[PDB]
Amino acid sequence: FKIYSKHTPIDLPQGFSALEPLVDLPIGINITRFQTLLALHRS
Amino acid sequence: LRSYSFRPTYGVGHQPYRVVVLSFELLHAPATVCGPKKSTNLVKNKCVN
Ligand SMILES: *[C@@H]1O[C@H](CO)[C@@H](O)[C@H](O)[C@H]1NC(C)=O
């Protein structure tokens, strides 16, 4: 399970930038679906 | 369930021995435990293997 990422400070804009590997995890796990997590408004 | 009665006056045939069992094998996952790569220095400017 590999993750590539990049953090560049400033609808998506227009440009080219290659992303570098961060981690590589020998898990073995199968994936068919995913979701996301968000920080709600409470205060 | 029975108990033990270890005492420090016993003979060798009853003294409590500590035993640990190392059961290890590979999986098709990447090997998360290797061995030693033999130590050795590094030379320069020589045709070497
Ligand atoms: C992932 O799912 C496939 C079937 O879609 C299965 O054949 C395969 O063995 C699974 N992989 C693992 C690592 O369980």
Side-chain angles (χ1 to χ4, degrees):
Chain A
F1 186 77
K2 295 181 180 180
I3 301 172
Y4 295 71
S5 67
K6 185 176 181 180
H7 182 191
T8 300
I10 299 168
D11 290 289
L12 295 172
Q14 184 177 9
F16 180 102
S17 178
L19 300 177
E20 296 180 22
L22 182 63
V23 299
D24 186 352
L25 286 78
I27 303 301
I29 192 167
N30 258 358
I31 300 171
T32 63
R33 66 188 69 189
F34 65 92
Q35 63 182 315
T36 65
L37 298 173
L38 300 172
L40 299 176
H41 182 71
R42 294 181 292 165
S43 177
Chain B
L1 269 292
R2 301 271 84 179
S3 299
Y4 277 126
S5 63
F6 299 124
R7 298 122 139 133
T9 62
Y10 279 8
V12 173
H14 310 297
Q15 290 187 340
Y17 274 60
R18 292 187 148 197
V19 185
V20 284
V21 163
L22 310 175
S23 155
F24 44 82
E25 76 279 347
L26 205 54
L27 283 173
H28 65 280
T32 77
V33 56
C34 260
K37 327 296 166 147
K38 311 176 172 167
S39 296
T40 184
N41 67 11
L42 178 64
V43 301
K44 296 182 180 180
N45 296 306
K46 296 182 180 180
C47 182
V48 298
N49 184 333

